[PDB]
């Protein structure tokens, strides 16, 4: 399963609290997203706070949900910019510092694995990549002979060419009645 | 405060033996190998008896192309109900079932059995972990040192641990006499003569 | 964690004796060979009794040209049904049967007997493996060192192991007193007096 | 090179010995996959075993392959959920523990990088992570406009609409001769 | 901003200086790429050196670029195949070694995250994977059309299926003036 994240599709407007199960080192390592908007941490004016007293722990929002079916994501990120423990000479080493370093490293690796799996992984069914029923988006207009095709590039005016046509399926149902077709470009039925 | 880990169990076993705790398990330069083998052996000995947390009910088994049933590597015991199969008597032998009555290693159809598996350390519950740790420490000390006072203290601790583990198991899994054989789907209400008289 | 293997059993016996573990079993330079011999001897001693997993019922035996019954090298005991054969009773002697009533080594037709076989270490089930291991360890320790308190401790462990083994056997085989001798096919439903009263 | 994963297509049925070259920590950290089937470690009825008395170290199946050209994969995955070291107070700190911790961290990072490379990896000359001659699949049928097309969608009945056709190619090469084409729905003609 | 990479499109030909901001441990960990061609580090026969005397640090080449708008890539990479610091028994512990080990681990994690981001990300506007408007190539032909359609398969003569063309837009734009359309393929209009 996902190691340090949980994605919830809300079910009722006005709710405030959502539960989460994974572990963490410091409270400021928890991030909350509301409808693709990152949510700041704090209290009062800040919109959410963490309740670490009840099992399982849950996060409480200071303002109720405006509309139901609004996605809320709880994901843990450790400090990727600075080490959590600094060693200085003359200090008596204790197991707490070493354990903190080990937990930081392991949690960072777990989160990286989670992100890699959540992205485009490899479908083990045939050993091929999969999107897991997603939509590929923001792909530039193909140029090279081996790119993928886009709906925009396929549907832009004049996209289909003469070589892009194979005969046999000029359906009469979709043939326009009001179309103006010159007789020179037309065929000649052989009426016996 | 998470559950007990393998390293914590090894440290507890060493401490009960009377030595200094060791840092880790990997590439150790101490008694880690002895502690590990003791813990594994006691875990296997406890698991091979069959409890409520390592038993599957009415599991289907499938034969191979030669009408032969092959068990997995970690299957400890296989039970077949007598009443359902009045003409077939099976007993486990190595990793294959044996048709004792007909003196054959072949069968005619798939079976519905209930088997007991041996679980890894990570998947055990807390009371099982506690009992396993204490028993392993007692056995290791008794086999290695052989003193008197340490043996007495380990005996007392082991007795207390066994009592606690058995009590936890029974209150978790609510064994009953009225229900009879558990393979029958519960028809019992267990109505309470202690409540409804007012 | 798979079932106990030969190398693990040998290491366990050596550790119970109180001597350092061995690396492999082929081309070693220690007491591992003596431990193997003790394991084999205790295995033979236990198997020669006849339990649920090493007994074949209704088995048919075939004679050779000289009208004699020959037994394999690993056959421990045979039993014939007195009711089924009134005028002939047999007792095992070496590898041949003796018709002690008629004082002859020769029979007239084939027999339908119950056969008990001594099995190799591979085919043995888990509880039998554990009991064999503990018993062999105790016997080898007594033979090598010769203490008394160590024998007391090993006796305690052996008693516990025997209790576990017997409980496992009686839970597996599901013996009964109503059914009588098992050579008759089960007509018993063992209908439960407890539950079906509501 | 592939740091800690070797995928091999079995040459012939009945083969049982395969080789590997990556370093490891424990014999239980090596996993073998056979066309999605997972094989358990051990000896005996266990369907694969490891051998270390020969350089390079090699694994051995316990049953030959039924058919040739069956994919067999050997991958090393160190512990990800449980640290290999847990410092306890009152012990004698030795360099072996620190070296083992360093090795575990390095091996985890190597395995994650190799998994990312095994996935879709950047096409340097272009920029989009190229599938590298693999058939991306397991994408559901299109739901929105920009969603890509699948086989069961582009070959599904009812997909014929009135937009994408063009002119300049349609000939007798695929029009059914026996088909009764409506004269009125057909085009015009002047017979001079 | 990527932690440990920077892609520069040369403003003009002939330049030899390029600046960078991220920190590092050893100068041997700095790789310089130009036009997907790797250049060695050193002096003389080499192509570039590293100057750390000023701030911010910059890298200098031994030869100017041939043409303007040339791709120049500078990205850090730590030692993956060997731990930077090994611990020896029988000495005095120093905080410098522990700090160096922590720095190496953190830098490797940073670099891996940067690689994943420069590869495949998830857009925070819709939650679907995005490519940041790049170009995809080296994709095998879709045996099943579950795969994204390759334009070579689209434009190949006769590769278009009869159902790929959707009748309804018949005009005179693409019928060739001298196209000898098979006469027995169209009827006549009901001229009155």
């Amino acid at each position: 399963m996902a190691f340090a994240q949980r994605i919830i599709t809300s079910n009722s407007a006005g709710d405030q609290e959502f539960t989460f199960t994974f572990d963490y080192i410091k409270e400021e390592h928890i991030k909350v997203f509301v409808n693709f908007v990152e949510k700041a941490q704090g209290t009062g004016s800040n919109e959410f706070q963490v309740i670490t007293n009840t099992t399982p722990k849950k996060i409480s929002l200071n303002t109720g949900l405006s509309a139901d079916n609004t996605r809320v994501e709880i994901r843990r990120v450790s400090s990727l910019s600075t080490p959590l423990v600094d060693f200085a000479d003359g200090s008596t080493l204790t197991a707490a510092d070493l354990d903190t370093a080990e937990k930081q490293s392991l949690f960072i690796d777990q989160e990286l694995d989670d992100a890699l799996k959540q992205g485009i992984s490899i479908d083990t069914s045939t050993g091929v990549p999969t999107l897991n029923s997603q939509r590929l988006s923001n792909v530039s207009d193909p140029v090279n002979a081996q790119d993928a095709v886009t709906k925009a590039y396929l549907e832009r005016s004049g996209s289909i060419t003469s070589t892009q046509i194979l005969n046999g399926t000029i359906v009469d149902a979709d043939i326009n009645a009001s179309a103006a077709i010159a007789k020179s470009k037309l065929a000649a039925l052989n009426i016996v | 405060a998470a559950r007990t880990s393998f390293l914590d169990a090894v440290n507890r076993v060493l401490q009960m033996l009377g030595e200094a705790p060791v840092n880790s398990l990997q590439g150790q330069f101490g008694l880690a190998k002895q502690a590990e083998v003791a813990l594994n052996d006691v875990s296997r000995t406890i698991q091979t008896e069959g409890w409520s947390f390592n038993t599957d009910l009415e599991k289907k088994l499938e034969r191979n192309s030669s009408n032969e049933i092959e068990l997995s590597s970690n299957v400890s015991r296989v039970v077949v109900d007598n009443l359902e199969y009045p003409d077939i008597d099976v007993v486990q032998r190595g990793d294959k079932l044996y048709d004792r009555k007909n003196n054959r290693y072949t069968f005619d159809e798939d079976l519905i059995v209930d088997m007991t598996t041996i679980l890894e350390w990570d998947l055990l519950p807390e009371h099982a972990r506690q009992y396993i740790t204490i028993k392993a420490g007692r056995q290791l000390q008794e086999a290695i040192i052989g003193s008197a006072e340490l043996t007495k203290l380990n005996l007392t601790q082991e007795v207390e641990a066994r009592s606690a583990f058995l009590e936890e198991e029974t209150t978790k899994s609510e064994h009953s006499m009225l229900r009879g054989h558990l393979n029958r789907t519960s028809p019992v209400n267990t109505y309470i003569p202690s409540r409804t008289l007012e």
Side-chain angles (χ1 to χ4, degrees), chain A, chain B:
Chain A
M1 250 203 86
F3 272 132
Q5 99 163 310
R6 165 122 180 281
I7 168 177
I8 299 167
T9 294
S10 66
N11 309 318
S12 41
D15 295 335
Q16 277 188 114
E17 57 306 350
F18 316 110
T19 83
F20 79 116
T21 66
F22 49 78
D23 282 17
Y24 71 102
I25 286 160
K26 311 274 292 286
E27 309 90 318
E28 30 266 42
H29 299 170
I30 302 300
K31 299 305 167 46
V32 180
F33 295 89
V34 177
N35 56 40
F36 319 105
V37 173
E38 181 285 355
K39 193 55 91 59
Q41 202 275 348
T43 182
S45 301
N46 267 266
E47 318 301 339
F48 99 101
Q49 70 179 331
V50 58
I51 304 276
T52 182
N53 189 19
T54 304
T55 280
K57 332 176 210 182
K58 42 189 214 325
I59 50 100
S60 181
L61 275 57
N62 296 332
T63 86
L65 258 283
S66 317
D68 64 331
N69 319 102
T70 305
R71 59 184 279 108
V72 177
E73 173 160 312
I74 321 292
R75 75 181 188 120
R76 185 202 62 210
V77 54
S78 297
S79 83
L80 270 180
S81 51
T82 54
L84 282 168
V85 54
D86 189 16
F87 289 118
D89 76 88
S91 296
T92 74
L93 77 166
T94 178
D97 301 354
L98 313 200
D99 286 355
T100 301
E102 211 56 12
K103 303 272 291 283
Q104 179 172 12
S105 188
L106 208 43
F107 284 0
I108 283 170
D109 276 335
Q110 290 223 91
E111 164 51 1
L112 254 204
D113 173 26
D114 213 310
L116 180 52
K117 213 60 71 194
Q118 143 84 352
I120 165 172
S121 71
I122 168 174
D123 183 13
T124 37
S125 72
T126 57
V128 310
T130 174
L131 260 302
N132 263 17
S133 301
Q134 278 327 90
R135 315 162 37 228
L136 210 62
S137 72
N138 245 335
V139 173
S140 275
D141 296 331
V143 168
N144 155 14
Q146 271 290 51
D147 323 291
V149 307
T150 87
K151 224 82 191 183
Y153 159 87
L154 203 38
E155 288 183 334
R156 54 72 170 181
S157 190
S159 176
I160 174 144
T161 57
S162 63
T163 166
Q164 278 166 292
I165 314 170
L166 181 143
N167 326 291
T169 38
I170 35 175
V171 310
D172 302 349
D174 281 320
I175 275 290
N176 198 310
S178 308
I181 326 290
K183 298 187 184 179
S184 58
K185 322 298 183 180
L186 302 181
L189 210 76
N190 273 5
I191 310 171
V192 179
Chain B
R3 274 149 271 156
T4 299
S5 77
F6 196 34
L7 268 292
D8 269 291
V10 155
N11 273 313
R12 182 49 147 83
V13 171
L14 285 203
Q15 191 208 69
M16 201 155 48
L17 189 40
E19 310 296 74
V22 81
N23 262 2
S24 70
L25 170 36
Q26 196 47 51
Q28 296 323 116
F29 281 9
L31 311 93
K33 285 170 241 277
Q34 299 273 196
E36 171 206 60
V37 301
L39 260 166
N40 288 322
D41 260 332
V42 181
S43 166
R44 178 169 34 235
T45 295
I46 289 292
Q47 256 156 350
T48 172
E49 195 158 10
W51 305 99
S52 81
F53 67 95
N54 66 342
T55 291
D56 320 330
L57 268 301
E58 62 106 28
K59 142 161 279 195
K60 174 107 141 40
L61 275 175
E62 217 56 31
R63 39 201 194 147
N64 61 357
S65 65
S66 301
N67 299 277
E68 216 171 7
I69 322 290
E70 268 161 297
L71 298 196
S72 314
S73 182
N74 55 344
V75 180
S76 99
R77 46 194 280 281
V78 163
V79 192
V80 167
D81 167 87
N82 251 16
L83 270 296
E84 283 270 17
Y85 303 76
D87 214 12
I88 290 313
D89 195 24
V90 316
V91 299
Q92 156 156 256
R93 263 189 187 169
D95 52 21
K96 326 172 103 173
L97 312 178
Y98 179 84
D99 187 325
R100 178 154 80 112
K101 166 72 67 73
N102 280 3
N103 315 265
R104 310 196 273 95
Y105 271 93
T106 77
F107 288 80
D108 272 340
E109 42 163 345
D110 322 296
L111 311 179
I112 316 295
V113 314
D114 43 357
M115 41 161 41
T116 315
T117 325
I118 288 198
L119 271 285
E120 281 66 351
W121 175 273
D122 180 27
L123 291 182
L124 303 179
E126 174 63 49
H127 55 89
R129 282 176 201 194
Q130 293 293 350
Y131 186 48
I132 279 185
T133 290
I134 293 202
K135 268 250 283 199
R138 190 270 271 251
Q139 215 175 81
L140 193 37
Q141 190 281 325
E142 179 142 349
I144 281 284
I145 293 313
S147 167
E149 283 151 324
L150 287 182
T151 315
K152 186 186 318 306
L153 309 180
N154 299 339
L155 246 190
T156 65
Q157 279 190 38
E158 177 271 354
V159 158
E160 198 171 7
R162 152 146 277 249
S163 159
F165 156 77
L166 203 43
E167 192 295 343
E168 181 46 0
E169 172 80 1
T170 189
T171 175
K172 209 174 255 188
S173 282
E174 48 94 30
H175 320 333
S176 181
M177 211 155 288
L178 287 211
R179 203 159 104 74
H181 206 7
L182 264 69
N183 248 314
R184 200 211 318 132
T185 310
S186 289
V188 76
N189 176 276
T190 67
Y191 206 56
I192 46 186
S194 45
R195 154 73 271 167
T196 323
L197 296 98
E198 332 299 335

